[PDB]
Amino acid sequence: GMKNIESLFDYSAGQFEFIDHLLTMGVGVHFAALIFFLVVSQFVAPKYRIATALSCIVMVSAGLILNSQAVMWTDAYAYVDGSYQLQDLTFSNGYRYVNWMATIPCLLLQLLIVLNLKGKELFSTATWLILAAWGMIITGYVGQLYEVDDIAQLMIWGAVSTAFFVVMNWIVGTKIFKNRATMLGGTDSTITKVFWLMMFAWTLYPIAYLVPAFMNNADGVVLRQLLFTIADISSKVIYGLMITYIAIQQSAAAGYVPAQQALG
Amino acid sequence: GMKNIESLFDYSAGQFEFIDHLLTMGVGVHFAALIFFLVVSQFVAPKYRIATALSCIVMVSAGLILNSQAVMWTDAYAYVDGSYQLQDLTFSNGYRYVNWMATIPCLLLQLLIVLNLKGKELFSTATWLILAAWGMIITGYVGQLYEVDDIAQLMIWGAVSTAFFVVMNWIVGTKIFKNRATMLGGTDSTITKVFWLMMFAWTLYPIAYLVPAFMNNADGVVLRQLLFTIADISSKVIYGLMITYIAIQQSAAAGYVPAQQALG
Amino acid sequence: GMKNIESLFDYSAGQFEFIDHLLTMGVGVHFAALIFFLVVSQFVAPKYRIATALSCIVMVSAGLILNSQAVMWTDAYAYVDGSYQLQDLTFSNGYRYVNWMATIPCLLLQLLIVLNLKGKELFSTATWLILAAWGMIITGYVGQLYEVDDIAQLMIWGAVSTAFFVVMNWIVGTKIFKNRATMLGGTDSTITKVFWLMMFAWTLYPIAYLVPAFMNNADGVVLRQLLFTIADISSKVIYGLMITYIAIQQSAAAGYVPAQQALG
Amino acid sequence: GMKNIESLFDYSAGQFEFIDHLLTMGVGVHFAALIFFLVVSQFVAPKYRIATALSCIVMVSAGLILNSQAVMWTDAYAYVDGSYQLQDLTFSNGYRYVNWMATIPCLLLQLLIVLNLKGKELFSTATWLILAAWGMIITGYVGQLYEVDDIAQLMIWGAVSTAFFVVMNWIVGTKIFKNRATMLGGTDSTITKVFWLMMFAWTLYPIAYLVPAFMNNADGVVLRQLLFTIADISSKVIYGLMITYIAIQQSAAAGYVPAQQALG
Amino acid sequence: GMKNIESLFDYSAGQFEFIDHLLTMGVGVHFAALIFFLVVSQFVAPKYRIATALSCIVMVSAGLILNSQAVMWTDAYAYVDGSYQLQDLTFSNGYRYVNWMATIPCLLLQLLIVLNLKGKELFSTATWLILAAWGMIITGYVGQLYEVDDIAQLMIWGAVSTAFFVVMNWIVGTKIFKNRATMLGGTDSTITKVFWLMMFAWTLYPIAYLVPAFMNNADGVVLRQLLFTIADISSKVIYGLMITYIAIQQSAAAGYVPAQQALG
Ligand SMILES: CCCCCCCCCCCCCCCCCC(=O)OC[C@H](COP(=O)([O-])OCC[N+](C)(C)C)OC(=O)CCCCCCCCCCCCCCCCC
Ligand SMILES: CC1=C(/C=C/C(C)=C/C=C/C(C)=C/C=C/C=C(C)/C=C/C=C(C)/C=C/C=C(C)/C=C/[C@H](O)C(C)(C)O)C(C)(C)C[C@H](O)C1
Ligand SMILES: CC1=C(/C=C/C(C)=C/C=C/C(C)=C/C=C/C=C(C)/C=C/C=C(C)/C=C/C=C(C)/C=C/[C@H](O)C(C)(C)O)C(C)(C)C[C@H](O)C1
Ligand SMILES: CC1=C(/C=C/C(C)=C/C=C/C(C)=C/C=C/C=C(C)/C=C/C=C(C)/C=C/C=C(C)/C=C/[C@H](O)C(C)(C)O)C(C)(C)C[C@H](O)C1
Ligand SMILES: CC1=C(/C=C/C(C)=C/C=C/C(C)=C/C=C/C=C(C)/C=C/C=C(C)/C=C/C=C(C)/C=C/[C@H](O)C(C)(C)O)C(C)(C)C[C@H](O)C1
Ligand SMILES: CC1=C(/C=C/C(C)=C/C=C/C(C)=C/C=C/C=C(C)/C=C/C=C(C)/C=C/C=C(C)/C=C/[C@H](O)C(C)(C)O)C(C)(C)C[C@H](O)C1
Ligand SMILES: CCCCCCCCCCCC(=O)OC[C@H](COP(=O)(O)OCC[N+](C)(C)C)OC(=O)CCCCCCCCCCC
Ligand SMILES: CCCCCCCCCCCC(=O)OC[C@H](COP(=O)(O)OCC[N+](C)(C)C)OC(=O)CCCCCCCCCCC
Ligand SMILES: CCCCCCCCCCCC(=O)OC[C@H](COP(=O)(O)OCC[N+](C)(C)C)OC(=O)CCCCCCCCCCC
Ligand SMILES: *C/C=C(C)/C=C/C=C(C)/C=C/C1=C(C)CCCC1(C)C
Ligand SMILES: *C/C=C(C)/C=C/C=C(C)/C=C/C1=C(C)CCCC1(C)C
Ligand SMILES: *C/C=C(C)/C=C/C=C(C)/C=C/C1=C(C)CCCC1(C)C
Ligand SMILES: *C/C=C(C)/C=C/C=C(C)/C=C/C1=C(C)CCCC1(C)C
Ligand SMILES: *C/C=C(C)/C=C/C=C(C)/C=C/C1=C(C)CCCC1(C)C
Ligand SMILES: CCCCCCCCCCCCCCCCCC
Ligand SMILES: CCCCCCCCCCCCCCCC
Ligand SMILES: CCCCCCCCCCCCCCCC
Ligand SMILES: CCCCCCCCCCCCCCCC
Ligand SMILES: CCCCCCCCCCCCCCCC
Ligand SMILES: CCCCCCCCCCCCCCCC
Ligand SMILES: CCCCCCCCCCCCCC
Ligand SMILES: CCCCCCCCCCCCCC
Ligand SMILES: CCCCCCCCCC
Ligand SMILES: [Cl-]
Ligand SMILES: [Cl-]
Ligand SMILES: [Cl-]
Ligand SMILES: [Cl-]
Ligand SMILES: [Cl-]
Ligand SMILES: [Cl-]
Ligand SMILES: [Cl-]
Ligand SMILES: [Cl-]
Ligand SMILES: [Cl-]
């Protein structure tokens, strides 16, 4: 009947509460980061301010999905005979997958803007990145419909998804290393750190996807929710702070005075 | 008893969850686009900033309807004997229909503004477009009261609704192709893309309306909710981003400096 | 036991759903109009910006009442043996009446500001209008406590309430027609349209009040909630848009540049 | 058992609904006033803008307490055998008392600012006022723990609380009448009105506190909720509007141009 | 079974209501402080405005955790046979612990900024403080898993957590006393008060942690929730107001005119 292994298990109070703690914190980090991005946007020059606005998109969108998951978790289970047990609703991770259709494009576009791509190059790269990402996400969603039924199918759609991932990482990595030299304000160093952050954070997702294949039980479910939390904070919030920092440094270097003031 | 076919079926966990995934994503994309429109409104010249404000209306209004539907979906059904089954509330789509009474005017007016219509021509066109749209929507709403009872009646009110649609598309298509030449900043190309986007996205709605007539079952329900989601994101959020992009390009061409800065 | 006739009936799914559709739309139109008023406030000169701020009050206040009513409607009734039937809470319209104590003053004050009244005249007129309005509202609230018990009493308190209405309409109509000539920017025409808008929209409320006296049944309840919806959108949102448009035209005429820019 | 007499009674539908009407209105007046304070803050000179900010604090804080109480009221009681009766939660007023620990300081500080106190005098007066207020509130809270058990104790802690009140009113009244002459823009008249508003509104609270001692029944409960509503609107929102009006008048008198514009 | 002693007891209506009063007040003080920080941020010079933005982070994040706890409290317990008793969900404090992973870094960084640290010194100190804090928090979280089972283990993980605390207090206290002399605008006095505020408020947390070890009963639970409330208001809101006041005084001293105006 069920699609996700979250819905197959009972949880101890400690497991159940840990997962609620993680989901609850995630919601407020995302909404808190939103206010911060709005306040510091005034120090970014207009030619880069879209990059900061794109972080605001991702914060609200991801914040509200987390908020839904956190409510669903407490609604789907009840404490009964010394364990939390499913009750009349089911819990799923598919909320995240569908949401990536909107947020992964935003994360990718904000990188292209601070790399200073422009015009045809900007629009071409953007298109290919967005199709590769939709490719990755849709095939991943279908795959994770088999996580209780058919691990074979999980792995096969996994592999296809991973093909798109690799193409997308290749485009990104190329544009970064080609454009690093033209970065302003000493941000060549910073953008390299961003590339590593992305390689680490983004790879947590396919690991979470494979948990059913290597840790099918309530401890795996705990692991998977922890991986998703770290990956959401790393890939969206911390990445966003680094993109905004790069935007401010380059704004100042280009002579925008609010940015120069913000830096002293 | 029931008015909509959503309320006639039981759903597998996978069908039921897919629909909740779609509804939930829609809510956050609309509220996220809101913040983006507020942040970039400062780069539009005042003569066009109403167009960007009208997008904020549409985002809030549509976002709150989606949020209602998404709550109603989880409230109307419960998982019971390995299927989701209705329980003591009913689910309906009429929330959307009534909401179009407000949002379709806003979408249409924001097009007229960036076409640079003014004065009598602006007010005349706006009036005729709004009456054509209210005509289309009211007749559609009555029609979809027959979707479980009387397909004949569904089709008849459909046909009347479609009459209004065609009138409305005719006015729009005329004003676009007449005014394309006077567009500034090379936006003659972009406005043409907008016209095709509208033709595709707006046409998804009458197709969703006909599903009871050609796929009366839970798979049709899934298809209809998918059609509404794509159509909402295409017709409101992506259309909104294209209107704002055109407004910025024309602002810069007219000599508004914040816009010129935003473009480099 | 019951005070309002809403609580006396069962509703078909179509009646019950139509009412929920109307309530839900009303909440979002009010909160959507709020964002619009904030964005265009920058085009109004400071001497008139209070008028636009007063619309923001009314939008938030009325939006939150509607939101309460919409939640109460779905909480008071459950679908049971093919009809919606009352369950353990009661539904009432008195939420609206008490909220008018705050909002009717705001609507009246925003008219006096754009009529360009000032000083003693402003403060005197404001006082008399606010007491007339409180007079109207309190007597109306008491009256509608008799809508199930005693139509006689309904009608008597009605008549007293209507006395205050007439006085209030008289003051307004006088100040409008006396001050229409001194309006700037060609807004003498516009303010006349506003006066008619008020005569139509405001009169829907006493009609809704009399429904128990001439249509005591679930169809009357449908009619009354539709009257309240149209009256709220007409009397608060569309009236708000007209007052703001008059404020912009007069600002421009007085030489405020943001207003001049906003109008080309 | 119970601490508050709210929890001792059953309520008629009319009594129960009237109280829900009052609580619901209070929430939206406070949130609506918030937007207005943010919009008109731009017309206050920076030297006084803290006063307007402090009203925003009080609006959010009091608005969210009201919102809690309004939800608890509908959650604590159910309609059963033609009356509302308590069910599995309890209703209490202590939410308000604890919230005054934050808001009474804010109300008092915003008065000191527009009286133009500065430096040592400002900080000394603020300290003594805050300790007097915490004294009043804590002793009041303890007192109202005896409203069902021991009226004797109610009255004794009342008397102590009233001692602090008197000290606090004395300090305020002194600083007002000593500083009235130095007020700018003709605000000596206005500040006197503020002092009377405070004397009336603030005194409603001790009267609501004594209702258990002189009207122990559901009609007393209705009276007490009405007194708290009037007192909240008078002491926070209307007082807020008067402090802001005085700040604008003195700003303009000091030569702040946005204020001069706002006044014509 | 249970992880936290909250879940072991029954509560009198007075105990249970006092705790709900504390949690409810906490939520609104944090959201109200948010609006205040946004409004006064315009008086801080851009070189210090990050400090004020960091308070906005902490207010949103902490406000939403409080809001969660406050809802859980009323959801976990029901009034039954004259006491509140647990029902089918469990209450825990771990929500706070996980949230500190985000907020303690923000509180620490906002101090470093107004101490005027810059560059290498800023980034080095920030890193060490954040690792010390994560050290303290993670060990604390594990420790408080033993509060019902094994006080021994509670104390052992306590001791390790306290080690990290001491290191972190040492770094802070050093940087304050080393940098106090270079503070502008007479803020050397103020920063010292901040250091004492932190020593008092921060120490309440380890005391709350030890309550299971010295007051295992419902009165201890009341004490612990009171300690957390005072500690949150002191350590986040009042600390926030002090850091912003120091930012404004130093801005004015550095010649920022908005700040000079804000101070007269
Ligand atoms: C936003 C929510 C509303 C506030 C919540 C509580 C209400 C007010 C609480 C007390 C006052 C707040 C602190 C003042 C703010 C900072 C003042 C400033 O600008 O600079 C500092 C000023 C400036 O100090 P200075 O060194 O410049 O010298 C004084 C200034 N001159 C020279 C001009 C006289 O110093 C102080 O006032 C120190 C403030 C110490 C704060 C101690 C309070 C902590 C303990 C309180 C526990 C209560 C918590 C629980 C209950 C609370 C109710 C919610
Ligand atoms: C889920 C799953 C599966 C997948 C699982 C997992 C964990 C998948 C993880 C995949 C990962 C981590 C992919 C990472 C890919 C990184 C790339 C492509 C990096 C490119 C980097 C470039 C192209 C730099 C280019 C640099 C340039 C051009 C400049 C370089 C030089 O620096 C310079 C020019 C400066 O000299 C399995 C189990 C496998 C199958 C199952 O069936 C399913
Ligand atoms: C639901 C339902 C029904 C409906 C179902 C469905 C799916 C209906 C869908 C209807 C559609 C897709 C309508 C789309 C209409 C597009 C129009 C009018 C486009 C105009 C475009 C202009 C007018 C350009 C004008 C351009 C001008 C004037 C200038 C052009 C040139 O550039 C030049 C400058 C040279 O003139 C049916 C089945 C019917 C009945 C059933 O029973 C129920
Ligand atoms: C509910 C209920 C009841 C009430 C029900 C209902 C539907 C009540 C509806 C009442 C209505 C529609 C009231 C409308 C009142 C309009 C007024 C006062 C208009 C003033 C207009 C001015 C003062 C212009 C002045 C113009 C001036 C001074 C100058 C004009 C010149 O042109 C110039 C330009 C030269 O100055 C009933 C059934 C009665 C009893 C039951 O028992 C209970
Ligand atoms: C609850 C309860 C109890 C109480 C319940 C209730 C309802 C209590 C009500 C208490 C009230 C209303 C207290 C009001 C206090 C007003 C004050 C201090 C006013 C100061 C005013 C100044 C200091 C002006 C000063 C003006 C000056 C210095 C100069 C003016 C000159 O004009 C100028 C300077 C201009 O020349 C009881 C029954 C008592 C016990 C029971 O057991 C429990
Ligand atoms: C929970 C628990 C446990 C813990 C419980 C509890 C309640 C723990 C509480 C711990 C506290 C309050 C620690 C406080 C630490 C303060 C520090 C390091 C302060 C440094 C201050 C500097 C370094 C200033 C330096 C100033 C300098 C260098 C100034 C220099 C000159 O003035 C200059 C010229 C530079 O200006 C126990 C019971 C232990 C175990 C159990 O088993 C579990
Ligand atoms: C993805 C969600 C958000 C998209 C953003 C919407 C734009 C609206 C606001 C514009 C503000 C502005 O100033 O626009 C300007 C910039 C671009 O021009 P420039 O940077 O000045 O280049 C300077 C050089 N020129 C003048 C020659 C151009 O806009 C963008 O980068 C627009 C986004 C383009 C990527 C779109 C990808 C298409 C995907 C197709 C796959 C299905
Ligand atoms: C109903 C919601 C009320 C909210 C209004 C108050 C907010 C104050 C913000 C200041 C903004 C501003 O610009 O203040 C000033 C404005 C305009 O007045 P003015 O410029 O002094 O007039 C011209 C003065 N000459 C002639 C010297 C140039 O004052 C108002 O419009 C005040 C509204 C009147 C209040 C009505 C009181 C009736 C109450 C009776 C109770 C039964
Ligand atoms: C038991 C606890 C008691 C402690 C009470 C503390 C009293 C408050 C101190 C005065 C603050 C004030 O309102 O204003 C603070 C100052 C006013 O300084 P000033 O004197 O005008 O400057 C002139 C200096 N001279 C006299 C030497 C010429 O303005 C500001 O820009 C500060 C901006 C706001 C900072 C945030 C603090 C606000 C907190 C309020 C929430 C309660
Ligand atoms: C905030 C959201 C982000 C950055 C999301 C990233 C998502 C991925 C990189 C997902 C990748 C997947 C694969 C490569 C294979 C397995 C299926 C996916 C979709 C989890
Ligand atoms: C954001 C919402 C939008 C743009 C809605 C568009 C809706 C339509 C164009 C609906 C058209 C209909 C017909 C042409 C026939 C059947 C009834 C309608 C109302 C669905
Ligand atoms: C946004 C709300 C508005 C403009 C409300 C207006 C309300 C009235 C004009 C109500 C009038 C009534 C009578 C004249 C008699 C019957 C009782 C009332 C209160 C419904
Ligand atoms: C918005 C909140 C305000 C202005 C609250 C004011 C509260 C009081 C003046 C409370 C006074 C009391 C006494 C003097 C005695 C009885 C107990 C109190 C606390 C109600
Ligand atoms: C707003 C949050 C703040 C300032 C949190 C502070 C937290 C601590 C100082 C926690 C310290 C702990 C110990 C020193 C030992 C016991 C375990 C902890 C985590 C409670
Ligand atoms: C058993 C009765 C079945 C019918 C239910 C009520 C009919 C409602 C039809 C109303 C017509 C559509 C109006 C839609 C526009 C809303 C205006 C704000
Ligand atoms: C008793 C069973 C509970 C299992 C979970 C305990 C995990 C402890 C790790 C603490 C990590 C806290 C910080 C979260 C990282 C974002
Ligand atoms: C807005 C775009 C939607 C995301 C696309 C997801 C792919 C959909 C394929 C799977 C549909 C599930 C149907 C039920 C499975 C048993
Ligand atoms: C500040 C809001 C007050 C305005 C409300 C009008 C007063 C209504 C009269 C009192 C009737 C309520 C008692 C219920 C008895 C059936
Ligand atoms: C932020 C501190 C809140 C203080 C609120 C008022 C003081 C509390 C009075 C003490 C009585 C508690 C009752 C305990 C249960 C019967
Ligand atoms: C001059 C350098 C300061 C000396 C360091 C003293 C640290 C003592 C910390 C004590 C913790 C309890 C704080 C009490 C709150 C007032
Ligand atoms: C020089 C660029 C090539 C590097 C290839 C990237 C592979 C990264 C694997 C992901 C795990 C590492 C996280 C730090
Ligand atoms: C100079 C004025 C003296 C103040 C006297 C205070 C008495 C307070 C009476 C109670 C307030 C009544 C509300 C209108
Ligand atoms: C604790 C309350 C009493 C404080 C009064 C201090 C002296 C006031 C003189 C202005
Ligand atoms: Cl720029
Ligand atoms: Cl996401
Ligand atoms: Cl313009
Ligand atoms: Cl819509
Ligand atoms: Cl003006
Ligand atoms: Cl209203
Ligand atoms: Cl100033
Ligand atoms: Cl309060
Ligand atoms: Cl600066």
PDB file of N, CA and C and ligand atoms in Angstrom, chain B residues 45-48, chain C residues 261-262, ligand 26:
ATOM      1  N   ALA B  45      10.087  51.621 -13.715  1.00  0.00           N
ATOM      2  CA  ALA B  45       9.662  53.024 -13.626  1.00  0.00           C
ATOM      3  C   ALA B  45       8.207  53.146 -13.156  1.00  0.00           C
ATOM      4  N   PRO B  46       7.849  54.171 -12.378  1.00  0.00           N
ATOM      5  CA  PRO B  46       6.488  54.373 -11.872  1.00  0.00           C
ATOM      6  C   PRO B  46       5.341  54.228 -12.868  1.00  0.00           C
ATOM      7  N   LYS B  47       5.552  54.693 -14.106  1.00  0.00           N
ATOM      8  CA  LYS B  47       4.596  54.541 -15.208  1.00  0.00           C
ATOM      9  C   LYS B  47       4.211  53.071 -15.437  1.00  0.00           C
ATOM     10  N   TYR B  48       5.065  52.107 -15.087  1.00  0.00           N
ATOM     11  CA  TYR B  48       4.790  50.691 -15.261  1.00  0.00           C
ATOM     12  C   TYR B  48       4.668  49.944 -13.940  1.00  0.00           C
TER      13      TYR B  48
ATOM     14  N   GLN C 261       4.990  61.250 -12.322  1.00  0.00           N
ATOM     15  CA  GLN C 261       5.629  60.091 -12.951  1.00  0.00           C
ATOM     16  C   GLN C 261       4.656  58.923 -13.050  1.00  0.00           C
ATOM     17  N   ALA C 262       3.950  58.598 -11.953  1.00  0.00           N
ATOM     18  CA  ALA C 262       3.099  57.430 -11.992  1.00  0.00           C
ATOM     19  C   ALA C 262       2.076  57.568 -13.105  1.00  0.00           C
TER      20      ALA C 262
HETATM   21 CL    CL F  26       7.551  56.653 -14.530  1.00  0.00          CL
END
